[PDB]
Design a protein around this ligand. Structure first.
Ligand SMILES: O=C(N[C@@H]1[C@@H](O)[C@H](O)[C@@H](CO)O[C@H]1O)OCC1=Cc2ccccc2S1(=O)=O
Ligand SMILES: O=C(N[C@@H]1[C@@H](O)[C@H](O)[C@@H](CO)O[C@H]1O)OCC1=Cc2ccccc2S1(=O)=O
Lengths: 364, 367
C-alpha cells in the first residue's frame, strides 16, 4: 500500500531490481496541472511513478510521455507489462474516449496509445473519480480502511447490513464517493448482492441543477452573477467557496482565494468559518438528494483537501450542522437520509493510482 | 416473448403438460392492487414462456404473499415444485440486499426473503427485486431475445448513438447505459449500467422520483404544489396519477370539477384541450427527470416503459407533443456542451410485462 515518486532515471534503475522482475501494471494519474505515471507490482502492492508537467495543458501530451518512457526503458522491463490503466479529469466513454475537459484541451484516445504500455484487451481509460472509487475498494481490500477513513456519523442501515464496525471496511452496500476539490467529483461503488461484487459507476452529480430549500435569494444571487442556473459544483468548488466568502463579508474585507479562505478558517476567522459552513451546507445537499436517488449504504468524502481540512470536520459544532443539513430532505420523514453512514478521508493517499492498479486487476 | 394468465387450478394443470417438464423459475410481479405469480421456462429458440395466476392484494399487506406461496405449494404437485431452480419476485418499493423490501406507500408490512418457503425460493437462487429493477432485467430480456424493435420505438435519436453503434436506433439496447423510467402510479427508475471493460449490462435500482425538483422558470407553479402538499415537491409529485390530477386542476381553475388521472388521459385522447394541456405539463416534468439524469448518469439511452406509456401512445404519436418533450429534454444548462442531445429517447410501444420477464432474466444469473 505504498508509492514512491521518483525521477525518470531513478525509476528505470528501480525496475532493474530483482524485486521488479515480475508482471507489471502501467498506471497514470492525470491532472490538469501535472500527471504521475509508473508501474505497480505484487502480499505487497508496491508502486513507483515519475511526474510530468502538463505544461501545454493538452491531454494529447500524454502520448509523448508514454513514448519517452518506452524509450528510456529496457525491453525486459516493458515486456512485463500485463495491463495499462490511466485516469483523466473528465467524463469518459467506452473506457476508451476521455473528455472534453474544462482544464485541458483535446481528447484522450486509447486507440492512439502505445500498446507496449497499454496491452490490447488489458487496458482502460478511467474518469478520475472512477479511479478513485476503485482506490477506495483497494484500501478496503488491503484491510486498512480505518487507517484512511474516519466515521463522521454512523447511519441507521450499517449495523443491519454489516457485522464489522463502521469505517473498518467499505461494506457490502453501495458507497457514494464524493471529492469536493477543484471540480466536484462523484462516483458510485455499486454493490451487486447477487454475485457479491462491487462495480464502480462514474457519475456527474456536480453538474445537476441545485434544487432549493429556503435559499432562493442566495441561489438567484449566484445565478445573476454566473448567468447560469447554479449547479452543485457552482456552490461546492474553489470558485464556490470564494463566492460564499464575498457574500459573508459584503465588501467589509478584501476578496480572498479558496486556499486563503480555508487557511483563514483554520486560523479561526469567523468570516472564513462562515464561508466553509455555507460550502458544506451545499455539499450536504448533494448528499441528501443522492442519498435518496442512489440509496447508498455509505458516503465517503475524499481528496487531499478533505484531509488538510480535517480541522473543520473535527469541530463537533460543524459536524452537528453538517449532519442536520444531510438530513434536510422531505424523505427524511421516512428516515432515508438517516440510513447513510458518512465517512471522511483522514490520511493522505493517492486513491487514483491505487484505483488504476485495481481496475487493472479486474481486466488482466 | 409470451405470458399467459390463468387460474390456479388451470395453471396447476398446464404445468403437468410435457412442454413444462423442464427446469422452472418461480416469478411474481407484485403491485399495490394485484400480484401476478407463476412459473417461467426457456423456450426455443431464444424465447421465454410464462404461466401465471392473478392474485388480488385485498389486505393491502405485503405479507399476504406468504399465504399465496403456501397455497401454491400445497395445491400443486410436488413433481412440479421439484423443477423449481430459482425464485424471484418484485415489489413496488425499495429493496435492500435483494432480501428486504419496503416499506411501501400503498401496502403495509415488509417483504422478507427469509420468511419465504424454500420450495419456491431455493437457497442461493432467490431474490426480491424492486419493480423497476425487475423492469430493467426485462428490458435486457427483450434485448436478449432479439426483439427490441418489436417492443420499443424511437422518440428521437441522440448524437451519441451512431458514435457507438452501426445498427439503427431502437433495434438493440446498445452498448451503453440505459436509463429506464416508468411514470405510472409512482414514478419508477432504474439504470442499466454498461461496463465497457467486460461488455456487461448490470441493473442498478434508483429512486429518482423522490428527488426534490430543481427549478427552471416555474417557481410559482412549484410553490403552488408546495402549498398543497406542505412538502417541497419531488418529481413523483408532478409525474404520477396525483401529479396529472394536479396539473388538470391548475389548467381548469375550478371551472370544471376534478376527475381521475385515468379520466384525464381518456379526455386527452378525445381531443379535450384542458386534459391535453395537463398531459403536456406532466411530460414537462418527466422530461426534467430526463435532462438532469442525462447529465448525472450520462446514459446512451432513456426508455419510457409501462402499460401507461403503451396505452397512451396517442400522446407520443403526436409530432407537436413530441417536439415539446424534446425541447424540454434539452432544457438544461449543460446542453450548451451537448450533453442532453447525446441521449436517445425510446418508448415501449407494445404491451409486455417487463417485470415478469425480468424476474426470470434475473433468475438466470442466480442459477
Ligand atoms: O468535466 C466535467 N466534470 C468533471 C468530472 O468528470 C470530474 O470527476 C470532477 C473532478 O475532477 O470535476 C468535474 O468538473 O464535466 C464536463 C464539463 C463540465 C464543465 C464546466 C464548465 C465548463 C466546461 C465544462 S465541460 O468540460 O463540458
Ligand atoms: O416507495 C418508494 N418508491 C417507489 C419506487 O421504489 C418504485 O419503483 C416506483 C414505481 O412503482 O414507485 C415509487 O414510489 O419510495 C419509498 C416511499 C415513498 C413514499 C411517498 C409517499 C408516502 C410514503 C412513501 S414511502 O413508502 O416511504
Amino acid at each position: 500500500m505504498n508509492i514512491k515518486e521518483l525521477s525518470l532515471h531513478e525509476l528505470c534503475e528501480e525496475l532493474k531490481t530483482p524485486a521488479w522482475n515480475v508482471p507489471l501494471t502501467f498506471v497514470g494519474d492525470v491532472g490538469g496541472t501535472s500527471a504521475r505515471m509508473g508501474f505497480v507490482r505484487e502480499d505487497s502492492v508496491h508502486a513507483c511513478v515519475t511526474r510530468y508537467s502538463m505544461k501545454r495543458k493538452d491531454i494529447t501530451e500524454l502520448i509523448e510521455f508514454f513514448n519517452e518512457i518506452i524509450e528510456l526503458m529496457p525491453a525486459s522491463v516493458i515486456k512485463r507489462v500485463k495491463a495499462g490503466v490511466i485516469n483523466v479529469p473528465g467524463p469518459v466513454t467506452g473506457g476508451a474516449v476521455g473528455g472534453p475537459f474544462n482544464n485541458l484541451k483535446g481528447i484522450a484516445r486509447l486507440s492512439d496509445y502505445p500498446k507496449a504500455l497499454f496491452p490490447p484487451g488489458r487496458s482502460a481509460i478511467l474518469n478520475d473519480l472512477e479511479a478513485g472509487g476503485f482506490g477506495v475498494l483497494a484500501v478496503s481490500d488491503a484491510h486498512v480502511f480505518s487507517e484512511y477513513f474516519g466515521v463522521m456519523w454512523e447511519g441507521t442501515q450499517w449495523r443491519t447490513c454489516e457485522q464489522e464496525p463502521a469505517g473498518s471496511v467499505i461494506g457490502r452496500g453501495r458507497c457514494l464517493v464524493l471529492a469536493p476539490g477543484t471540480g466536484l467529483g462523484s462516483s458510485l461503488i455499486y454493490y451487486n448482492p447477487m454475485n457479491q461484487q462491487h462495480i464502480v459507476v462514474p457519475l456527474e452529480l456536480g453538474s445537476q441543477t441545485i434544487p432549493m430549500r429556503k435559499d432562493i435569494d442566495y441561489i438567484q444571487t449566484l445565478h445573476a452573477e454566473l448567468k447560469l442556473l447554479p449547479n452543485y459544483e457552482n456552490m461546492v468548488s474553489g470558485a464556490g467557496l470564494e463566492f460564499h466568502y464575498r457574500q459573508v463579508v459584503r465588501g467589509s474585507r478584501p476578496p480572498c482565494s479558496a486556499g486563503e479562505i480555508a487557511k483563514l478558517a483554520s486560523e479561526g476567522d469567523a468570516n472564513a468559518c462562515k464561508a466553509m459552513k455555507k460550502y458544506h451546507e451545499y455539499l450536504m445537499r448533494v448528499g441528501s438528494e443522492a442519498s435518496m436517488a442512489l440509496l447508498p449504504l455509505t458516503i465517503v468524502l475524499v481528496g487531499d483537501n478533505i484531509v488538510n481540512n480535517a480541522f473543520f470536520y473535527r469541530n463537533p459544532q460543524n459536524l452537528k450542522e453538517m449532519h442536520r443539513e444531510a438530513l434536510n430532505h422531505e424523505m427524511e420523514r421516512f428516515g432515508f437520509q438517516s440510513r447513510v453512514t458518512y465517512l471522511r478521508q483522514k490520511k493522505l493517499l493517492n486513491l487514483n493510482l491505487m484505483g488504476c492498479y485495481r481496475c487493472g486487476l479486474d481486466l488482466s
